[PDB]
Symmetry: C2
Subunit: 420 residues, 2 copies
């Protein structure tokens, strides 16, 4: 297996339309969570979300028009646009714009989404009913298929390597990165764009998650306090939106061209709960196996771990994951920092695992553990540092990131500082 | 990398609710294509589809009730039910029902869909608009997520290994099998259920694919003749439905327990066109790269190839693939049989690549190449044997199968008779 490194980062998040402003604001303790004003939510029990700040592109805002022409945007659901934007960033960051046949052929794209084009499907359904089939757009299908994020990105940049997509709810972005890394390690590609995208902030999605009682409902008038992983007063997740893309690259390829390497991906672990369609396993056994698998692949002892980015969605399951991590770490619990950045940007669903992978990379770069916001009163005492309220500056060389998706689909990633 | 074999087959198709009856009718030259009677299609340009024969389970019919309780079926879109049924078959065929922790943990599931729960999303949309958010089902989300196929199957059978899912339109089922095989080869699992499922026969999907003029329209009065890959009079694909699942197993694990081995998976190739959102590369270069990649991985020379299962959807693109195959085969073109079974069962979308893999396996078992039905007047002459009208009995030890999906996502698989 060839070694795989990370050479570019792209992010459109509820904190900012780019990577560096997202990170800056994350570390400053800012929240992306607010009352929804874009559409009617007066009849919903959840009236808040973590939303991308829209604008002209200055001061960390996001301008869709800079990434895709207006008229083109109208042919696709937003998840595709977000993916294009994050990719634009990533490629630029990696300084990788393949032109030659050789370069284009060895560069692939693997972008997933949990839900994809749900909004567009509903709107087309209304057209069909109200206006009939002759009014359905020729672009209905492509603008709605999950794999068309990979497709659109591939077309824009002439990326002719493996073109692939995954869908695993909350663990989508993590699977994307792990799978893409394996394609490189196995020799199917030398460079991959990888990550996740989601645009679930719409009435149908909000009603849907409210219906299975998954969302926070008691803090519609105090949005910045709603997302509170580990806190005794948590009451469900806050839905977010965005896209997170990394450029993965074979080590010698990167070295040869003088690329700046952020970190190395060294471990990937997968498991299944086989328990329940939406509830996580009460035993945390699946989570534990995911982590152990990732660590074993990475040949990393828990004695070497510095920071864990939790799944930690602000649901009752928070403490199941906590207990599992305690079991994994054993004696080393007091020396590992673990936090949930969902406390700041909500739950990005399909993009979550990728955004968090990004945060992990930057934790290494800047030797700082992001905070768990709002952690006023932990449900249970633990020896693990959950980094309440404010980030912690500390040595971070080796990191583990967890993603535990609906359906009982678990993924864990291990990354480490690149020395050589 | 450990070797990976196929030890179980499961299939719910437009010819039959099981594998053996599907294969039997396929070889008899039967078509699963008929006028749609279940819902109104009078206002649609395409009024035909390849539909699963529903019944009490006898004489090759499909009874959903035997696979999932009625009350449970009402909570999910049909793609999930098909998957369950196919999985039920495959595990039975493999005689693999893990009960120990060890056996459960080493058995995973990787089932994809191209489109998933589109019908249910549209229906929930109508509810949302007409009755309001309060009336949305608590089961809306889980019953609609693509990955919940893997989820439901995992839960039913206590499969606690990697639980994963992919989405790549027409190449979904191929990616699933190739990806699942790699998980085994890499030690992440010892057994995997893998494949694809789709339930796209509904008004929204039909209107959608009609809108981008992907579907056959001129033979609504002669359905069994509509799907005619390579024929001068072809005019688009015929939408099908169903699920196809294989049990993949590490070689030594299979041998130790005395499992019957159908074939070995030895190659998997991936590429991207980077051309167009729905149309294939005019040059076929992507297709060509996918095939070559699979063959190289398999360490198979084209001189050893016996049978090719084409993507061949009955669209103008049929001859692009044909040309690409000719370039790959070169001098050996006359030695190889190639057919499209979409001529018989239509385009299963997410399930196509897995259904076709199954047909490959059986082509090996029975030394027989399925026909390309309806091939009266080929658009172009070729040295390749396109097996028109009736199947051809011949030596079949090494097989290649192609899947080329919307978005420019290509997959090829290479399988071979197992000797040792
Ligand atoms: K995480
Ligand atoms: K095929």
């Amino acid at each position: 297996m060839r070694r795989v490194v990370i050479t570019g980062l792209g992010l459109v998040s509820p904190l900012a339309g780019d990577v560096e402003y997202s990170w800056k604001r994350l570390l400053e303790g800012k929240s992306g969570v607010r009352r929804i004003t874009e559409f009617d939510v007066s009849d919903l029990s959840c009236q808040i979300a973590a939303r991308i700040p829209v604008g002209d592109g200055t001061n960390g805002t996001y301008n869709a028009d800079l990434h895709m022409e207006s008229k083109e945007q109208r042919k696709v659901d937003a998840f595709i646009v977000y993916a294009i934007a994050a990719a634009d960033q990533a490629l630029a960051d990696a300084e990788w714009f393949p032109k030659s046949d050789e370069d284009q052929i060895c560069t692939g794209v693997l972008i997933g989404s949990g839900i994809g084009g749900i909004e567009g499907i509903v709107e087309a359904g209304y057209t069909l009913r109200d206006k009939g089939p002759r009014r359905i757009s020729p672009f209905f299908i492509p603008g709605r298929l999950i794999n068309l994020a990979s497709g659109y990105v591939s077309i824009k940049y002439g990326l002719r390597g493996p073109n692939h997509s995954v869908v695993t709810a909350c663990s989508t972005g993590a699977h994307a990165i792990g799978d893409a890394a394996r394609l490189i390690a196995l020799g199917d590609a030398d460079v991959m764009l990888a990550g996740g995208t989601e645009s679930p902030i719409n009435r149908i999605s909000l009603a849907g998650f409210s219906a299975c009682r998954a969302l926070s409902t008691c803090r519609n008038d105090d949005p910045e306090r709603a997302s509170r992983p580990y806190d005794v007063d948590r009451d469900g997740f806050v839905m977010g939106e965005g896209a997170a893309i990394v450029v993965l690259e074979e080590l010698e390829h990167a070295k040869k061209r003088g690329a700046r390497i952020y970190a190395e991906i060294i471990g990937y672990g997968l498991s299944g709960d086989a328990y329940h369609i939406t509830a996580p396993s009460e035993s945390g056994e699946g989570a534990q196996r995911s982590m152990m698998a990732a660590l074993k692949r990475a040949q990393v002892n828990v004695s070497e771990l510095d920071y864990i980015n939790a799944h930690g969605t602000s649901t009752m399951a928070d403490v199941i994951e906590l207990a599992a991590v305690e079991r994994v770490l054993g004696y080393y619990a007091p020396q590992v920092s673990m936090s949930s950045t969902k406390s700041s940007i909500g739950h990005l669903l399909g993009a979550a695992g990728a955004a968090e992978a990004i945060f992990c990379v930057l934790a290494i770069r800047d030797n700082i553990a992001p905070a768990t916001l709002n952690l006023e009163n932990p449900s249970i005492e633990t020896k693990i540092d959950l980094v309440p309220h404010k980030p912690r500056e500390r040595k971070i060389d080796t990191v583990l990131s967890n993603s535990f998706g609906f359906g009982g689909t678990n993924a864990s990633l291990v990354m480490r500082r690149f020395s050589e």
